[PDB]
Amino acid sequence: AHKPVGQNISEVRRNARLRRHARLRKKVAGTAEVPRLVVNRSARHIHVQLVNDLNGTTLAAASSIEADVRAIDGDKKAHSVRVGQLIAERAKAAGVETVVFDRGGYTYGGRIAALADAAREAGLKF
Amino acid sequence: IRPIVKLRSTAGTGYTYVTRKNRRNDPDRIVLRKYDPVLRRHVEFREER
Amino acid sequence: SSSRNGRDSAAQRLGVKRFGGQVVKAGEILVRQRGTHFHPGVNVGRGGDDTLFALAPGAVEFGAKRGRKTVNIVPVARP
Amino acid sequence: MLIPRKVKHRKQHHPEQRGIASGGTSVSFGDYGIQALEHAYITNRQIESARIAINRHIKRGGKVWINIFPDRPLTKKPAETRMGSGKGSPEWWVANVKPGRVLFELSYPDEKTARDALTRAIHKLPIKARIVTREE
Amino acid sequence: AELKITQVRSTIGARWKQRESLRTLGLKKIRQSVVREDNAQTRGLINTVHHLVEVEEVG
RNA sequence: GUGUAAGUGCACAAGGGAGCUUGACUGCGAGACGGACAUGUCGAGCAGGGACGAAAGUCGGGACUAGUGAUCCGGCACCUCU
RNA sequence: AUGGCCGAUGGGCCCCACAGGGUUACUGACGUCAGCCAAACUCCGAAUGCCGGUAAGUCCAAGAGUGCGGCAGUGAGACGGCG
RNA sequence: GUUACGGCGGUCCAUAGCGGCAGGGAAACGCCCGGUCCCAUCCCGAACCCGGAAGCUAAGCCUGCCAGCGCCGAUGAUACUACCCAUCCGGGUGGAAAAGUAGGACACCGCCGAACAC
């Protein structure tokens, strides 16, 4: 038989990411007038939601899954800027200009920072 | 003489005042610390001995 | 003989000043406390002495959130 | 004489002599036992004298248990002194014995000698008490 | 549904709640009888001053 | 473990570490606590000019509660007062 | 803090070195079974009381309550019930 | 709309956990491959970050099985208890009513998205 003994780095990463997500989410929370732009970031893809934590409901979502962004001949940062553009314009459609950025317990840089800067360009305020 | 004395941090560019406390056994007299004065804005303050 | 005791501090009048349902103004002291036996929640803030004050009008609502006992201020809807 | 190795508080309020005992109401250790019917502070001296009385009325053979430890201090001001000037220093060590509480237990073959030994102990004790049995 | 409540004992030695409950029932003297309903309010008042009153279910 | 007594709290960390820093600010303060009086305490929020932070936001000393002394009198600095 | 159980630990003994071993008349921690205690212990937790709201009651009165002001006196309490 | 599903949240944050023993890899979550680039380690490309898609569900994650450990847990009774009666009975009345125990309780709810369906 087999029995691994230590929790894998995947478990460590997941639990730690959730810890520091909750850490910043102590201060950050979303509303209908200032939604929480919450990020999830895998090594393959990136996802964002706009949340109103009052009711725990999502207003607009975007991701590097759909073909319109998956078809880019570029890096994950290129996919990220496209996702930021998409969630910006979808939020504008939903009646949003101002949000608060939840980086999902990740480090603000690279892909996440590019997404955020792209949404800032496209019109969202943060 | 006390270790933690009054200090009386005064300002450069106008010698007006802010006061707080700082231990004497730090190897200096010079607590250069920024502060907002009346009649000007944020500038460096030092301790007149 | 003699006693080495005899001292005591001043009573600090800690406690809960505005209980559940009590309508309060903003800034009203709800809870005088040393730590966070009562935690701050909706429209409630924590002072330097761990005192709980309303950030908005409403009726005090005592609740729980992840085991912590919380103090919340629910709005009073005007007619 | 029984006594604790230490107490966190040497000077304590008098234990409340009220209520029927909620624990130690039964035997759980032996065959025959002493049950109390009054409230009282039972002391080191009382406990040791009663234990000794049992151990003398009957000898090698059987076993004895003491289901109470006197860990509750009782102070005494000096004599020929005025009231005040602080609380007294610990003099006595007692156990607050509510009714129902089983104090002494033993296992011995003959019910006669066992009951008689327990009677000796009760006469050493300051309270009205009772013989009880593991069976009922 | 209706209760005749007759004060039989005095307020002397009686506590504030009891005295004011008697007042709230409308009683001010021994052998003063007042007629009330069997509601919860007067039931609670009677529970507070049962020792001071004699109660009779009308009809 | 929390600088230090104890308690209340803190693992969501208020505990441990690093970077940058001086808000250990100025003018103010809705409203409250406590309340013989005098004392004392919390305080969102507005502005100024700042620190940190990508931003939200936080910062008017310290996890909290002790670490202090009324008034008179006089001293020092500054002030478009007399 | 009571008794059991286990048995580290040491003390001895024997193999007798010095280590490593078994073995114990003994101590016997830790852990565990059962029964217990605490004003400065609490996984718990009342009743009452307290705060607030609300509906009523009393309501030709409690001669209430609050605010202001004039005038006070009191600021040595006692016993009893309960804690 | 359906998923052995990916996120974001909620609950008097344990009926939710832990530990099972049998399973899954569609997209996704993941480990995983490498450090050229932003970035990074008080040392370490372990982590953080970036670029990637070789193989693997082994683990995390997820699904089913549970009273094994913990958690919840009535009722009734008892204790305690406000008021009352009672010339010591701390006796008793009518109200409130635990803890412990026992019987029994094994995750749920919402929003979005993904694949499919459509």
XYZ file of C-alpha atoms (C1' of nucleotides) in Angstrom:
732
model
C 0.000 0.000 0.000
C 0.939 3.669 0.151
C 0.337 6.483 2.605
C 1.886 9.941 2.135
C 2.691 11.632 5.392
C 2.967 15.381 4.837
C 0.326 17.606 3.335
C 1.241 18.469 -0.219
C 2.328 21.904 -1.351
C -0.996 22.169 -3.155
C -2.806 21.941 0.165
C -0.353 24.375 1.723
C -0.849 26.852 -1.109
C -4.626 26.544 -1.070
C -4.981 26.995 2.674
C -2.448 29.824 2.775
C -4.039 31.636 -0.143
C -7.389 31.358 1.589
C -5.859 32.615 4.826
C -4.444 35.736 3.254
C -7.565 36.229 1.161
C -9.602 36.313 4.359
C -6.897 38.524 5.841
C -7.357 41.283 3.292
C -11.093 40.600 3.149
C -11.315 41.623 6.798
C -10.950 45.144 5.381
C -12.299 44.617 1.874
C -15.956 43.953 1.211
C -18.213 44.608 -1.739
C -21.501 46.426 -2.124
C -23.983 47.030 -4.906
C -22.526 50.532 -5.271
C -18.904 49.464 -4.755
C -18.635 45.769 -5.637
C -15.747 43.553 -4.709
C -13.750 42.630 -7.792
C -12.503 39.272 -6.579
C -9.793 37.415 -8.462
C -8.878 33.761 -8.778
C -5.650 32.861 -10.538
C -4.522 29.445 -11.660
C -1.377 28.750 -13.624
C -3.524 28.238 -16.731
C -6.264 30.811 -16.392
C -7.622 33.752 -14.460
C -11.131 34.540 -13.298
C -12.826 37.578 -11.826
C -16.203 38.193 -10.271
C -17.970 41.328 -9.102
C -19.565 40.568 -5.766
C -22.034 42.309 -3.504
C -21.167 40.614 -0.234
C -24.309 42.028 1.394
C -26.323 39.306 -0.344
C -23.374 37.213 -1.492
C -24.231 37.549 -5.148
C -22.230 38.072 -8.299
C -23.079 40.881 -10.689
C -20.687 40.241 -13.559
C -17.981 37.681 -14.197
C -15.117 37.292 -16.604
C -12.454 34.730 -17.262
C -9.675 33.589 -19.550
C -11.790 30.561 -20.487
C -14.004 31.921 -23.229
C -12.707 31.773 -26.765
C -12.646 35.541 -27.308
C -9.671 35.780 -24.918
C -8.393 32.222 -25.104
C -7.690 32.865 -28.799
C -5.055 35.535 -28.100
C -1.539 34.814 -29.349
C 0.086 36.139 -26.222
C 0.964 35.546 -22.611
C -1.139 35.079 -19.515
C -0.708 38.799 -18.922
C -2.291 39.419 -22.318
C -5.170 37.179 -21.308
C -5.313 39.159 -18.074
C -5.589 42.565 -19.735
C -8.330 41.183 -21.945
C -10.157 39.834 -18.904
C -9.858 43.214 -17.228
C -11.284 44.919 -20.296
C -14.166 42.460 -20.394
C -15.060 42.760 -16.734
C -14.788 46.539 -16.970
C -17.235 46.776 -19.850
C -19.553 44.180 -18.319
C -19.534 46.140 -15.070
C -20.326 49.317 -16.977
C -23.239 47.442 -18.519
C -24.286 46.414 -15.009
C -24.084 50.030 -13.839
C -20.710 50.144 -12.110
C -17.839 52.621 -12.215
C -16.237 52.094 -8.805
C -15.166 48.824 -7.219
C -12.764 47.573 -4.576
C -10.155 45.111 -5.756
C -9.891 41.773 -3.965
C -6.708 40.106 -5.173
C -7.948 36.760 -3.891
C -5.066 36.275 -1.518
C -2.524 36.614 -4.299
C 0.388 38.958 -4.689
C -0.549 42.102 -6.584
C 1.722 41.833 -9.561
C 2.169 40.373 -12.974
C -1.066 38.951 -14.265
C -3.297 40.332 -11.529
C -1.728 43.777 -11.685
C -2.070 43.806 -15.459
C -5.727 42.864 -15.206
C -6.310 45.583 -12.641
C -4.474 48.234 -14.646
C -6.435 47.207 -17.724
C -9.758 47.574 -15.939
C -8.583 50.901 -14.536
C -7.869 52.015 -18.089
C -11.180 50.691 -19.386
C -13.023 52.763 -16.799
C -13.324 51.128 -13.411
C -12.119 53.203 -10.475
C -9.593 51.789 -8.048
C 18.603 63.965 35.020
C 16.152 61.514 33.496
C 16.813 59.016 30.686
C 13.569 59.828 28.909
C 13.421 63.624 28.838
C 10.948 66.147 27.344
C 12.983 66.793 24.057
C 10.986 69.812 22.686
C 11.488 69.031 18.981
C 11.728 72.376 17.180
C 11.701 73.120 13.486
C 14.089 74.118 10.815
C 12.866 76.947 8.616
C 11.102 78.628 11.490
C 12.042 77.584 15.014
C 8.577 76.841 16.371
C 7.809 73.714 18.326
C 6.347 70.258 18.897
C 7.113 68.354 22.136
C 7.163 64.461 22.793
C 9.690 62.163 24.718
C 12.956 60.374 23.762
C 15.601 58.349 25.803
C 18.885 60.121 26.427
C 20.995 56.991 25.997
C 20.424 57.115 22.271
C 23.861 58.218 21.051
C 22.757 61.662 19.868
C 20.748 64.777 20.625
C 19.293 64.967 17.132
C 15.815 63.485 16.728
C 15.239 64.634 13.165
C 11.567 63.884 12.586
C 9.133 65.341 10.084
C 6.126 67.208 11.403
C 3.423 69.624 10.318
C 3.860 73.127 11.725
C 1.364 75.861 11.917
C 2.274 78.718 9.501
C 4.018 76.300 7.125
C 3.580 72.652 6.151
C 5.463 69.373 6.671
C 9.129 69.999 7.361
C 11.920 68.504 9.406
C 12.006 69.121 13.140
C 15.036 68.825 15.365
C 15.576 69.030 19.222
C 17.039 72.334 20.405
C 19.403 71.232 23.361
C -0.471 42.631 62.970
C -1.198 44.224 59.606
C -2.482 43.430 56.125
C -0.379 43.974 53.008
C -3.608 44.271 51.018
C -6.254 47.007 51.086
C -5.962 48.372 47.569
C -8.437 48.428 44.726
C -8.847 50.324 41.514
C -11.660 52.612 40.569
C -14.621 50.889 39.030
C -14.513 51.698 35.351
C -18.250 51.352 34.674
C -17.640 48.952 31.859
C -20.543 47.066 30.435
C -23.213 47.347 27.822
C -24.748 50.790 27.664
C -27.278 50.195 24.894
C -28.877 46.778 24.759
C -30.780 45.036 22.003
C -33.475 47.112 20.414
C -32.282 50.356 21.947
C -32.329 53.071 19.330
C -29.042 54.928 19.311
C -27.468 57.874 17.605
C -24.173 57.763 15.807
C -21.192 57.868 18.098
C -23.249 56.462 20.945
C -21.244 54.274 23.251
C -22.778 50.815 23.154
C -20.168 48.707 24.903
C -17.420 49.694 27.287
C -14.969 46.838 27.464
C -11.293 46.057 27.651
C -10.892 43.492 24.912
C -13.347 42.160 22.367
C -15.779 40.102 24.350
C -18.097 41.946 21.990
C -16.775 42.496 18.529
C -17.718 45.229 16.071
C -19.907 44.542 13.093
C -22.374 46.382 10.922
C -22.137 50.147 11.383
C -20.116 49.723 14.565
C -16.561 50.799 15.200
C -13.897 49.982 17.739
C -12.059 52.663 19.648
C -8.621 52.656 21.111
C -9.915 51.318 24.419
C -11.861 48.597 22.586
C -15.064 50.570 23.075
C -17.865 49.989 20.600
C -19.612 52.964 19.062
C -22.305 53.259 16.453
C -21.176 54.603 13.104
C -24.793 55.237 12.133
C -28.238 55.405 13.694
C -30.305 52.353 14.248
C -31.337 49.815 16.811
C -28.622 47.788 18.471
C -28.608 44.172 17.353
C -26.514 41.602 19.156
C -25.447 38.799 16.882
C -22.749 36.247 16.241
C -20.308 35.821 13.395
C -17.879 32.900 13.341
C -18.218 32.373 17.080
C -17.455 35.959 17.974
C -20.244 37.842 19.660
C -20.901 40.930 17.563
C -22.724 44.199 17.971
C -24.549 45.458 14.911
C -26.665 48.516 14.206
C -29.663 47.773 12.014
C -31.231 50.818 10.325
C -34.566 52.162 11.493
C -36.599 52.650 8.341
C -38.501 55.918 8.538
C -42.221 55.706 7.676
C -3.052 14.021 59.038
C -3.968 14.748 55.456
C -2.968 18.096 54.012
C -2.417 19.413 50.465
C 1.005 20.044 49.042
C -0.141 23.522 48.066
C -3.159 25.710 47.506
C -3.415 28.597 45.098
C -5.259 30.583 47.784
C -4.296 29.953 51.399
C -7.016 32.155 52.890
C -10.454 31.206 51.631
C -14.028 31.911 52.489
C -15.848 29.398 54.571
C -17.359 26.661 52.399
C -21.097 27.003 52.022
C -22.851 24.519 54.303
C -25.925 24.134 52.162
C -27.381 21.737 49.665
C -27.462 17.993 49.465
C -24.386 16.404 47.977
C -24.478 15.833 44.234
C -21.336 13.717 44.027
C -19.853 11.046 46.184
C -23.396 10.079 47.130
C -22.541 6.403 46.580
C -19.792 3.896 47.249
C -17.885 3.302 44.004
C -14.793 2.035 45.895
C -15.705 -0.657 48.410
C -18.524 -2.623 49.998
C -19.533 -0.681 53.120
C -19.347 3.049 53.642
C -20.088 6.021 55.837
C -22.696 8.405 54.464
C -23.254 11.780 56.089
C -26.620 13.220 57.085
C -25.567 16.673 58.315
C -23.487 19.516 57.007
C -20.104 19.915 58.612
C -16.491 20.804 58.110
C -14.630 17.532 58.577
C -10.992 18.037 59.491
C -7.674 16.257 59.247
C -7.867 15.154 62.855
C -11.356 13.740 62.495
C -10.450 11.894 59.306
C -7.274 10.405 60.714
C -8.869 9.420 64.002
C -11.711 7.685 62.202
C -9.361 5.910 59.800
C -7.288 4.795 62.765
C -10.371 3.636 64.634
C -11.279 1.435 61.696
C -7.735 0.126 61.325
C -7.653 -0.781 65.023
C -11.113 -2.313 65.276
C -10.066 -4.532 62.414
C -6.551 -5.384 61.468
C -4.705 -6.815 58.450
C -7.479 -7.830 56.101
C -9.647 -5.596 54.005
C -9.077 -2.125 52.655
C -10.112 1.422 53.511
C -10.671 4.478 51.323
C -11.137 8.120 52.240
C -13.247 9.803 49.584
C -12.612 13.314 50.919
C -9.451 15.349 51.161
C -9.399 18.353 53.490
C -8.065 20.928 51.056
C -10.197 23.814 52.330
C -8.380 26.103 54.775
C -9.905 27.620 57.849
C -8.066 30.508 59.417
C -7.686 31.486 63.030
C -6.923 34.894 64.364
C -4.470 34.871 67.268
C -5.898 34.798 70.741
C -6.097 37.859 72.966
C -6.376 40.111 69.923
C -8.896 42.618 68.676
C -11.060 42.232 65.628
C -9.415 43.516 62.495
C -5.790 43.941 61.529
C -6.272 41.428 58.738
C -7.504 37.921 58.191
C -6.022 35.135 60.228
C -3.559 32.585 59.098
C -4.565 29.019 58.185
C -4.902 26.733 61.183
C -7.322 23.988 60.175
C -7.795 22.031 56.977
C -11.305 20.783 56.352
C -13.522 19.230 53.735
C -17.017 20.572 53.255
C -19.251 17.579 53.771
C -22.780 17.924 52.587
C -25.361 15.242 53.376
C -25.281 12.198 51.178
C -21.539 12.487 50.675
C -19.783 9.222 51.323
C -16.723 9.928 53.439
C -15.161 6.586 54.293
C -15.332 3.278 52.509
C -14.085 -0.175 53.238
C -14.102 -3.716 52.011
C -13.895 -6.360 54.721
C -15.256 -9.926 54.842
C -17.556 -9.875 57.899
C -20.351 -7.318 57.817
C -20.408 -7.314 61.617
C -16.858 -6.118 62.165
C -17.059 -3.788 59.193
C -20.198 -2.070 60.455
C -18.785 -1.879 63.962
C -15.568 -0.298 62.713
C -17.568 2.242 60.764
C -19.539 2.920 63.935
C -16.295 3.649 65.778
C -15.382 6.057 63.008
C -18.767 7.777 63.125
C -18.379 8.271 66.843
C -15.070 9.943 66.103
C -16.907 12.107 63.596
C -18.880 15.255 64.484
C -22.005 14.444 62.476
C -24.871 12.050 62.288
C -23.996 9.470 59.684
C -25.089 6.172 58.302
C -23.849 2.860 57.041
C -24.372 2.303 53.330
C -23.714 -0.564 50.971
C -22.477 -0.900 47.423
C -25.423 -3.189 46.727
C -28.111 -0.610 47.544
C -63.747 35.981 32.284
C -64.357 38.439 35.111
C -62.703 38.333 38.518
C -63.730 40.025 41.731
C -60.540 40.831 43.600
C -60.937 41.760 47.256
C -58.038 43.157 49.235
C -57.912 41.234 52.508
C -54.436 42.003 53.816
C -52.580 45.256 54.155
C -49.796 46.966 52.268
C -47.824 47.353 55.487
C -44.756 45.218 55.080
C -45.646 44.798 51.422
C -43.143 45.538 48.726
C -43.303 48.257 46.118
C -44.359 45.950 43.313
C -47.178 44.622 45.461
C -48.438 48.022 46.574
C -48.363 49.401 43.060
C -49.983 46.266 41.674
C -52.838 46.798 44.094
C -53.078 50.419 43.004
C -52.982 49.286 39.382
C -55.872 46.961 40.157
C -57.695 49.863 41.781
C -57.450 48.862 45.432
C -56.652 51.192 48.292
C -58.054 49.564 51.438
C -58.869 46.284 53.083
C -62.145 44.745 51.889
C -62.095 46.915 48.776
C -63.300 44.789 45.886
C -62.603 45.590 42.247
C -63.858 43.705 39.213
C -61.440 43.072 36.364
C -61.104 40.677 33.451
C -59.251 37.341 33.425
C -56.599 38.698 31.087
C -52.912 37.941 31.393
C -52.194 41.374 32.833
C -54.543 41.047 35.783
C -53.489 37.421 36.134
C -49.925 38.601 36.612
C -51.042 41.245 39.065
C -52.894 38.600 41.047
C -49.820 36.389 40.914
C -47.869 39.264 42.402
C -50.407 39.941 45.179
C -52.183 36.626 45.702
C -51.277 36.783 49.379
C -53.027 40.160 49.682
C -56.203 39.350 47.758
C -59.098 36.943 47.634
C -60.257 36.189 44.111
C -63.657 35.058 42.882
C -64.610 34.057 39.364
C -67.741 36.040 38.570
C -70.599 33.836 37.438
C 3.519 34.701 23.047
C 1.388 39.297 23.863
C 7.357 45.384 26.789
C 5.841 45.045 32.225
C 0.787 43.218 37.378
C -3.797 40.877 36.718
C -8.130 40.400 34.031
C -10.673 40.874 29.324
C -9.073 39.772 24.636
C -6.039 38.340 20.508
C -4.628 32.151 16.079
C -9.415 36.203 11.409
C -4.312 37.164 14.778
C -3.691 42.453 18.677
C 1.486 37.004 18.615
C 6.539 36.372 14.857
C 9.301 38.737 10.513
C 10.593 42.358 6.584
C 10.250 47.104 3.703
C 8.991 52.245 3.741
C 8.147 55.745 7.323
C 7.019 59.669 11.652
C -0.381 60.493 12.179
C 4.061 59.698 19.118
C 0.298 65.641 13.422
C -2.321 71.114 12.852
C -7.407 73.188 13.030
C -11.954 70.962 14.570
C -15.537 67.495 16.283
C -21.809 65.236 15.272
C -22.770 62.134 19.129
C -22.031 59.405 23.537
C -19.886 56.967 28.189
C -18.879 58.163 33.056
C -20.805 61.437 36.038
C -21.730 65.661 43.540
C -18.426 69.043 41.337
C -13.561 69.232 39.520
C -11.446 65.246 36.848
C -11.625 61.363 33.261
C -12.983 58.394 28.438
C -14.450 56.929 23.384
C -15.497 59.262 18.913
C -17.323 58.508 13.192
C -16.623 62.502 10.226
C -14.602 67.736 7.469
C -10.237 70.310 6.059
C -4.863 71.104 5.864
C -0.556 69.036 4.808
C 1.704 64.002 4.944
C 3.304 58.186 5.721
C 2.274 53.431 3.872
C -0.460 51.022 0.193
C -1.544 49.274 -6.835
C -6.152 50.725 -4.638
C -9.740 50.356 -1.131
C -8.405 52.336 3.046
C -5.616 52.949 7.817
C -2.746 56.229 10.772
C -4.469 62.323 15.940
C 0.946 56.914 19.826
C 1.518 51.753 21.844
C -4.114 44.997 22.160
C -6.899 47.416 26.232
C -7.156 49.297 31.135
C -2.053 52.025 35.505
C 2.751 54.813 34.441
C 0.456 60.507 37.418
C -0.489 66.223 40.242
C -5.753 70.883 40.296
C -5.022 76.052 41.172
C -1.847 79.969 42.291
C 2.921 81.758 41.029
C 6.712 82.203 37.803
C 10.012 80.657 33.388
C 11.022 79.770 28.004
C 9.689 80.196 22.621
C 6.270 82.288 19.071
C 2.123 85.880 18.223
C -0.357 91.889 12.822
C -3.062 91.676 21.223
C -2.260 95.784 24.927
C -7.123 15.531 45.156
C -8.827 9.507 46.419
C -8.226 4.592 44.889
C -7.012 0.975 41.031
C -4.089 -0.412 36.168
C 0.177 0.340 33.169
C 5.053 1.800 33.948
C 8.619 5.318 32.396
C 12.096 7.125 36.387
C 15.277 6.210 39.965
C 17.236 2.547 44.617
C 18.868 -2.241 45.171
C 20.100 -7.157 43.401
C 22.315 -10.374 39.979
C 25.436 -10.885 35.180
C 28.636 -7.928 39.618
C 34.008 -3.637 35.162
C 32.563 1.505 32.955
C 28.770 -0.015 28.883
C 24.696 -3.127 27.685
C 21.451 -6.227 30.252
C 17.521 -9.039 33.004
C 15.229 -8.864 38.156
C 12.832 -6.367 41.845
C 10.659 -6.402 48.833
C 10.634 -0.306 46.884
C 9.550 4.671 44.572
C 6.708 4.707 41.095
C 6.178 10.212 36.626
C 3.188 10.293 32.039
C -1.196 8.009 30.450
C -5.662 5.589 31.504
C -10.603 3.480 34.497
C -13.904 5.106 38.281
C -15.378 8.490 42.006
C -14.502 14.155 43.883
C -13.497 19.637 45.102
C -12.706 25.369 44.323
C -14.549 33.157 46.050
C -9.906 34.845 42.801
C -11.329 27.274 37.891
C -15.224 27.256 33.986
C -17.043 23.103 28.084
C -21.926 25.086 30.790
C -25.697 27.832 32.964
C -30.433 29.584 35.378
C -34.212 32.154 38.253
C -34.277 37.039 39.516
C -32.731 41.820 38.667
C -31.274 45.425 34.918
C -31.641 48.189 29.920
C -34.959 49.109 25.947
C -39.570 48.628 23.279
C -44.641 47.698 23.247
C -50.066 47.021 24.847
C -52.753 47.955 28.838
C -53.684 49.225 34.020
C -54.053 53.144 37.939
C -55.803 57.635 36.152
C -62.261 63.590 40.116
C -54.682 59.818 41.663
C -50.229 57.649 42.464
C -51.013 63.470 44.905
C -46.190 60.029 40.534
C -41.879 61.454 36.930
C -38.575 65.252 34.579
C -36.440 70.453 34.214
C -35.658 75.280 36.643
C -35.450 78.140 40.959
C -36.528 79.643 46.664
C -36.180 77.134 51.542
C -34.247 73.181 53.894
C -32.912 69.293 57.221
C -29.960 64.879 56.972
C -24.881 63.281 56.051
C -23.910 58.990 64.378
C -28.592 54.818 62.157
C -30.935 50.330 64.578
C -33.088 45.386 64.494
C -35.237 41.702 61.620
C -35.777 38.428 56.657
C -32.605 36.978 52.451
C -27.374 36.897 49.962
C -31.857 22.161 -17.147
C -27.816 17.685 -15.375
C -23.160 17.153 -13.181
C -18.741 12.427 -8.506
C -17.293 20.529 -10.644
C -14.599 25.532 -10.396
C -15.067 29.951 -7.750
C -17.456 33.805 -4.339
C -20.146 33.948 0.126
C -23.721 32.633 4.294
C -25.305 29.725 9.029
C -26.864 30.759 17.106
C -19.470 28.486 12.061
C -19.209 21.288 14.497
C -25.872 18.238 12.827
C -20.810 21.289 9.057
C -15.068 18.690 12.105
C -11.434 14.624 12.446
C -10.466 9.814 11.139
C -12.516 6.311 7.777
C -12.594 2.729 3.048
C -13.867 2.786 -2.050
C -13.923 6.110 -6.037
C -13.388 10.737 -10.156
C -10.085 14.208 -13.821
C -15.168 16.700 -19.511
C -13.896 22.207 -18.997
C -11.950 23.678 -14.452
C -9.035 23.229 -9.754
C -4.497 21.086 -9.208
C -0.090 19.080 -8.595
C 3.601 19.268 -12.494
C 7.972 21.303 -16.540
C 11.515 25.360 -16.499
C 13.441 30.154 -14.770
C 14.539 34.066 -20.526
C 11.339 38.247 -18.901
C 8.164 41.662 -14.094
C 9.119 39.738 -9.358
C 11.450 36.960 -5.083
C 14.239 34.186 -0.867
C 17.148 37.912 6.209
C 19.996 31.189 2.221
C 17.136 28.424 -1.428
C 12.618 29.746 -8.665
C 10.622 25.565 -1.835
C 7.600 29.888 -1.491
C 6.244 34.693 -4.093
C 6.266 35.868 -9.338
C 6.705 34.802 -14.554
C 6.767 31.688 -18.890
C 4.707 26.815 -20.153
C 1.861 21.942 -21.299
C 5.587 16.605 -21.120
C 2.209 13.057 -17.330
C -0.854 12.261 -13.063
C -5.268 12.194 -10.427
C -0.626 10.099 -6.247
C -1.946 14.128 -3.222
C -5.012 18.582 -2.516
C -10.228 19.375 -4.253
C -14.620 16.597 -5.101
C -18.479 12.227 -4.679
C -20.630 7.903 -1.802
C -20.415 4.938 2.335
C -20.563 6.854 9.285
C -22.899 7.301 15.769
C -15.281 5.027 15.453
C -13.408 9.974 18.157
C -15.348 14.641 18.773
C -19.902 18.232 18.126
C -25.544 18.886 18.669
C -29.152 16.972 21.912
C -34.854 17.154 23.575
C -38.512 15.260 26.973
C -39.251 14.074 31.935
C -36.825 14.458 36.594
C -33.451 16.826 39.810
C -30.576 20.878 41.614
C -30.830 26.048 42.047
C -34.401 29.914 42.047
C -38.121 35.333 42.221
C -42.821 35.561 45.019
C -45.890 33.244 48.772
C -47.305 30.076 53.033
C -44.973 28.282 57.326
C -43.435 29.813 65.147
C -36.672 26.357 63.543
C -38.737 21.594 59.647
C -34.486 25.637 54.850
C -40.359 22.156 55.247
C -43.983 23.265 51.442
C -47.160 26.121 47.254
C -47.809 28.039 42.534
C -44.289 30.089 38.388
C -39.273 29.889 35.828
C -35.975 25.945 35.204
C -30.604 24.016 34.340
C -25.625 21.219 34.076
C -24.744 16.271 33.696
C -27.102 11.876 31.721
C -29.995 9.114 28.436
C -33.008 8.682 23.998
C -31.673 10.289 19.645
C -29.363 13.870 15.707
C -23.488 12.828 10.190
C -24.125 19.347 6.443
C -27.156 22.661 4.456
C -28.465 27.527 1.638
C -27.594 31.191 -2.043
C -24.910 33.833 -6.528
C -21.784 33.379 -10.763
C -19.103 30.471 -14.041
C -17.481 25.878 -16.645
C -18.435 21.820 -19.596
C -22.331 19.255 -21.573
C -27.533 19.715 -22.561
C -29.969 23.398 -25.040
